Amino acid sequence: RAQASGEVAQTLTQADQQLSAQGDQVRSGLESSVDGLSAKLASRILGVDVNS
Amino acid sequence: AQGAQQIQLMRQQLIRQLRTGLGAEAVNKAAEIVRAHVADPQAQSATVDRFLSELEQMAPSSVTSRLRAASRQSLAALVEKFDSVAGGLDADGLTNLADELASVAKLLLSETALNKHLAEPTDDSAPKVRLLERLLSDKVSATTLDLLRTAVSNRWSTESNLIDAVEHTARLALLKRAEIAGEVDEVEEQLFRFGRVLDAEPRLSALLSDYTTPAEGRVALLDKALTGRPGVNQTAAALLSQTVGLLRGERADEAVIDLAELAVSRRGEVVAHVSAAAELSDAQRTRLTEVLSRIYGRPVSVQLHVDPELLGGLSITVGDEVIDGSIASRLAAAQTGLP
Amino acid sequence: KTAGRVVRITGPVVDVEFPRGSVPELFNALHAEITFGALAKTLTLEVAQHLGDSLVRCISMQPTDGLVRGVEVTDTGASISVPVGDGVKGHVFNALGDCLDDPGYGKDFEHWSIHRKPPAFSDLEPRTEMLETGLKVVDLLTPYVRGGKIALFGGAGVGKTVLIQEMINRIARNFGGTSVFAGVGERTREGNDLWVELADANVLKDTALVFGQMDEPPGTRMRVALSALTMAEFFRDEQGQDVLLFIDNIFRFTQAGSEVSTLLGRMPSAVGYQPTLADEMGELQERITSTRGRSITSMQAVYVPADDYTDPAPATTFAHLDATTELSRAVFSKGIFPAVDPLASSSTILDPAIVGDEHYRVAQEVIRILQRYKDLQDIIAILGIDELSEEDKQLVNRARRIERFLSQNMMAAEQFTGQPGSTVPLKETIEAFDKLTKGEFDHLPEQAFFLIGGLDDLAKKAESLGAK
Amino acid sequence: TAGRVVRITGPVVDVEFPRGSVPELFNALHAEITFGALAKTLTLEVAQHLGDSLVRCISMQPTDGLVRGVEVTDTGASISVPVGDGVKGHVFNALGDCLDDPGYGKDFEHWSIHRKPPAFSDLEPRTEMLETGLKVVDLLTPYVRGGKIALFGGAGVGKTVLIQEMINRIARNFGGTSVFAGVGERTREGNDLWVELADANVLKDTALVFGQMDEPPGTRMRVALSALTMAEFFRDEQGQDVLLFIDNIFRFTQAGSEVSTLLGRMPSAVGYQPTLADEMGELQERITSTRGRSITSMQAVYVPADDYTDPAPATTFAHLDATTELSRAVFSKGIFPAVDPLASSSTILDPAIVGDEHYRVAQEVIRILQRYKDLQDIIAILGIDELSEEDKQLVNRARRIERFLSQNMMAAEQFTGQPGSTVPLKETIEAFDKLTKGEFDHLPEQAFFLIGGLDDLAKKAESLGAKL
Amino acid sequence: TISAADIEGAIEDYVSSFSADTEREEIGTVIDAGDGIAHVEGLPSVMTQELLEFPGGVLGVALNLDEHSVGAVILGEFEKIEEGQQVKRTGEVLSVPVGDAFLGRVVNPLGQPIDGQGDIAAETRRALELQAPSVVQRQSVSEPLQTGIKAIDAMTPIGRGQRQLIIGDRKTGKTAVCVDTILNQREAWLTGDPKQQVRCVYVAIGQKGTTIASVKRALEEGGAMEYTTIVAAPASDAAGFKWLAPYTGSAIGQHWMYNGKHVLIVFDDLSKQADAYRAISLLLRRPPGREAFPGDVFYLHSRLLERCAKLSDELGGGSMTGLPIIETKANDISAFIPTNVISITDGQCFLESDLFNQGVRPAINVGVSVSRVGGAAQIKAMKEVAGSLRLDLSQYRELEAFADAASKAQLDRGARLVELLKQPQYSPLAVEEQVVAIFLGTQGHLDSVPVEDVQRFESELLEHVKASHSDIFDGIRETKKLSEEAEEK
Ligand SMILES: Nc1ncnc2c1ncn2[C@@H]1O[C@H](COP(=O)(O)OP(=O)(O)OP(=O)(O)O)[C@@H](O)[C@H]1O
């Protein structure tokens, strides 16, 4: 059980590192997309399709 | 299995963090976009027109608060009596009646036991009438004496209501002479403007709201500062001075709001305070008046309050009811409704 | 302008009137000036309530002596904020984050509001990793949890602060993470002594100290804990460090809350406590927690008024704790240090699935023997051990030896007796108590078990006294 | 002419009326909750006249969904419940509405639930015994035909079980009417009683009025009055013997307290309303037998926290002819019914009514049990062997007597899985005379546990190996 | 990998579906606010106990309705509330979503998930203050709800539709008993028969978040999370959530109860609900009473607990079993809330710290613990073997306190019975095995074995009967009684 706990902690830290890298490198990808979301939200609130 | 579940939970934690961050960024960007676009006055007109169309499609509804039932009935009887009496009087006579009513109200303020006795409910009124006559049968006109007789004949929930009623009657008299002058619209607009400015200058109202200070000092301050101005109607100035003279711990601006309410009410219309970020065109004003009257049936008078924070749209309000069409409220709802 | 003015002053509570549209939000920090020469200062008020008519009731972080009605009050637009970062380690701050050992130090640091929500329920993960201290009683009967919440309950002068010092020595000396100490309504000289002790043991460099002590207004005493917690939260979240959070004493935070509530016009509650006692304790205790992968091991001294353990303050504190160590005046009178009541202290991880079968069995047997000994106190205090059955007499002797053996020469106890402390590994404690509960030391005198460490110490002391 | 809601705080509603239309005190008013989910017609009982045409009223149903300003109608009369011989066999609530058949009883004669007690000239002491068949009750707490009987006790000591037992032992063979009032009790218990009465075929002669403990305070205040109004109709109009069972009467009092402060009453000692004794006296004095018209009322009095000094039971004590005081100690010792023979009393337990033999046996039993209670502490500390021979034999006799007072009740078969028993009064006197004389000392005390007469004692002795 | 497309679509759903409809609405204004309370002028048509919306999506409940203003308790965040803020009616009394989707989820007292696992598909909505079943809408409690504990199942049996109070000092094993009861329903759930299935609802009030997480982990490991819903109101929650959580759980359970299902609900614990309600009432400035509690605290708990019922057949035959928990201080059941709740429920299991320390686990105090349903909540064989057992254990304790051949025989039998009922945590015992164990006890088959070995003899023997002669259990498990042939074998 001690060995299992140690290896579980190891895999946990490696998974955490890879997940942090994934989030960091996907934030940039979605940075370009969020413009569309903002524009569409503005269009909905204004009642007209605001292009900007 | 526990380690695998922990990995899944940490992935979900990262996902939730990203959702919060992206949602915040998107709502902020949308707010910036709307605030930038709405700076165009044509966009303001377009959103106002859309809101007016919505109001047109809105389903019509067939639907003095502090006064209690007995007090409301007494005030109704008193105003009916005033309508019966002062109708035949002239502008000078109406001014005299208003001045005498204000003077007697100030006298009632000066002494408390007399007010308590006069306003004390009782089945009979003859003792009260005799008391009033023995007090001031000489210093008031016949019309004023009869109006006060009627006022004290009925009953009021609280002592102050009595003086309030008298104050109310006084205002009516002034309003009536305004109708004789034919400048009712001008005085209504002047009262609304004075209420607006008093709202904008809270310190001035506070300096006027301290009833402890002598009435003459506050009245002279207002005259030299606000009430006395070249482009001010004399009737509005007199009404405001009388109101501030009888300010029994109520704010000056709220008193002016009450004055405007009464002025519009005596005409039969109902005031609708419409908050807008830009001034409306005459066509917009007419359309808004028509639609508001249609939903509320009774004729309504629209009072525009400029407020750029709304970012377009309108925020109508009558009584305890509000139609919140402002764009800012929609933006807040969008921000608060996101996952 | 948008500035407000003082209207009412009732002790450390101030009413402030504001122009409409400028009423500060709740918890915002306001600033006023006391200009009387002797007491001149800048009051930092905290908006506590909105009274209506553009009035706000505020709690003063400083004494209000010399304050005048109508003075100008300015709103900063944000709540009390304290410096954060690795720079706060090795320095002493007050409830407002002002450095005391180096006035002005930390202005350029990043600042965090002392008010924030606890971690979301999705982040919380139960902690069950035992934290071995080296104290026989703590290791055996109420093991501490790493990343869990530990509390030290006790009346006045039973050893709460000495136990906190012992746990700092045992856990913080060789600690790879960060340490935060919060003095909340305790002795000022205690804070100075702790500062000197840490500077001597060279643990100060790793520790951040925040002190609001007895001679402070109730607002300071009820916000200093939030300040220290804010520093600990920064270390937990933005740095992934394993933080140690020492609080002494949290009951003082609750008591300052009671004082403020009395000054705020709130209706009283049972024993005159504030109606929001449980709520406030809830926010403060829920912020002090370990999230998934991020560890805070917190230890709090909880004062028990008038030796009354049913008082609402400790009673509500009991629910927020993973491990509880209840010091008893009855034990303290016997001279047993630590004065731990083994029949009332508890640990959520004292179960076979976490501490192992033999550990749990030995702890259960010790508790059973001590409970039986307690149940016989009524008979013994009148007639003595003479009327008990042979089984009961043997059990009483065993229980006396066990309760004496649960005492230990603590490290921090040296300053009181000139005797260095001792550390007992958990396996040694389990073996020793298994032997003792089996009757393998009944021949030794009772005093051989008093204020010693492991089995070697027991053998040596019994040899010195005259036994084997 | 109608009123309007002005204030709402839980079950208390202030109503403003036009002057000249203020309702009389205790008048019933009707308000409408129009919300679909909680739509209903609130019944408000006028409690106070606040002046200015404002009246404070207590709502009989939950006020959830009530809106300020809604119309309030004046019924012009108090809450009137249906009366007659039709009510027998049906379940009603505090307002007289039928539950087992809604709409039944609308065409009956209706009596206002507020009534004056009988004139002092019509009162007459009752001194006729009511044999029940329970050894303890028959011997030490004889009940009175047409008198007031109470069963005092804490929570879960056997008040309801004993009430059911008395229904079984008295109401089944009763030739008159029965009225049961479930005042602030469990709905499950009410349903069980309804089913049991239907099964026993006693429902047709019984009227059930339930105001349960999920109802608002007003219903729990008026259910007792409604049931007592039905009982008063049966007593005064039909001239019939009546059995009135109330369980639990204390709830009535409790309900008053729940609304006392909301009505604007300064609390009395122990948080009870100032009008405790006055309201209790009105309600109780309405419960009585007059000259030639008999009500044999039996009430269950809850004793909060087992404290018999509590103002509620202490006040209630003065309104009873016989009181069976159930004890928590006797209950926890496994003795059923858990009667405290030293605390129970009956006004007819004197030689002139029950005879010299019954009185002598009862007094000797009381003496023995009192001496045993005195010797309990000495026996616990110094053991029985210390006592003198007289005290030793008295202790054995007292243990046998105390166990023999227990009995196997029919209503308790659901708990002991055993059939009940009945013991004629003569047999009880004989058995307890023999017990006080020591003629059963050779029998094991366990043979006296939960049995009927002497035959059961002999059979259990032979089961245990001993001989009578 | 985190699917950028998935999250983009997740926010696309809301942004596309975002809407706001202008509508005539009564206005209110926060005239004052502080400490989780607000006062709102206006809203003349507001109903009592009606939900109110404050800016920022904050929610409140209108408690005090007088002419000047409306006192409102803020549910959730309250430092956002400001003087002058616009308050909107809702035209709705407090209600929560309800449906089978809530099974296996953790939600706040408003039905909003807090476990971060997605939205819950609510079948419908149910008001929190719907009346309990009437006297004619119930049937007598007749179905056992096996907790798996020999002591409880034998001496304080619980039926479906019964309110059994778990009362005791802190750390006496109350939550342990409740969680063991919830876990014992695993077998019933796996049978797939809604007549046998029991759906649990664990309500945590004023409880540390990590404790709720640990309880959820315990339920997950045992598989109880399939049929269990957690309503969480941790210590960090506002007094409004702590006050409302038991009613949220009660409504969630009631939805199932009124559809023929059998529900078990655990309130852990009602003492903290009472404290939160006291705080709300004091902040609202209502006149206090005993221990500063409001006059309607008993009404609070009584109307909460009477909603646990066993419905008649015409109403569907469903049931809800209540397991309220009460924490006492210094073992004083004479306090206000403990007395109230004891007087409310259908029996109490009173746990004692002294008994727990002596090794008696669960620390049930036989003398003062009872079940008011009684043998009706037991199968036939359990009745046969336990009806005497309970009172005989009471007598044994009395005699042991007091101290011939009969007395010593009684002491020996009582001792063996006492060590018969000692059960480890997380060691459920099926009803047939419980019947066989109590048979060993009360029928005299443990008199030969020494006391110190009784437990061992109880375990091994049962295991033996499991491996060979399993048919015995089948009999009990099938006929729900111990046949003469089975008893002889
Ligand atoms: N291990 C020990 N060995 C010897 N003396 C001790 C020990 N622990 C405590 N004491 C004595 O007890 C006194 C009180 O200890 P301590 O200050 O830690 O108690 P406390 O509970 O924090 O008190 P207070 O309520 O005053 O803050 C110490 O000054 C010392 O005299």
Ligand SMILES: Nc1ncnc2c1ncn2[C@@H]1O[C@H](COP(=O)(O)OP(=O)(O)OP(=O)(O)O)[C@@H](O)[C@H]1O
């Ligand atoms: N039958 C049992 N046998 C052994 N240990 C038990 C038993 N029941 C409970 N425990 C343990 O006792 C401790 C207290 O249990 P639990 O948390 O259920 O009690 P509680 O009264 O609800 O506590 P609290 O006051 O913390 O809410 C836990 O370690 C639990 O594992």
Ligand SMILES: Nc1ncnc2c1ncn2[C@@H]1O[C@H](COP(=O)(O)OP(=O)(O)O)[C@@H](O)[C@H]1O
């Ligand atoms: N004759 C009896 N035999 C066995 N148990 C009894 C007997 N009388 C009462 N009890 C026990 O006392 C408990 C409480 O009974 P009840 O009268 O319903 O409650 P209360 O006394 O609070 O009204 C029951 O659950 C029952 O087990």
Ligand SMILES: [Mg+2]
């Ligand atoms: Mg100290």
Ligand SMILES: [Mg+2]
């Ligand atoms: Mg009962």
Ligand SMILES: [Mg+2]
């Ligand atoms: Mg618990």
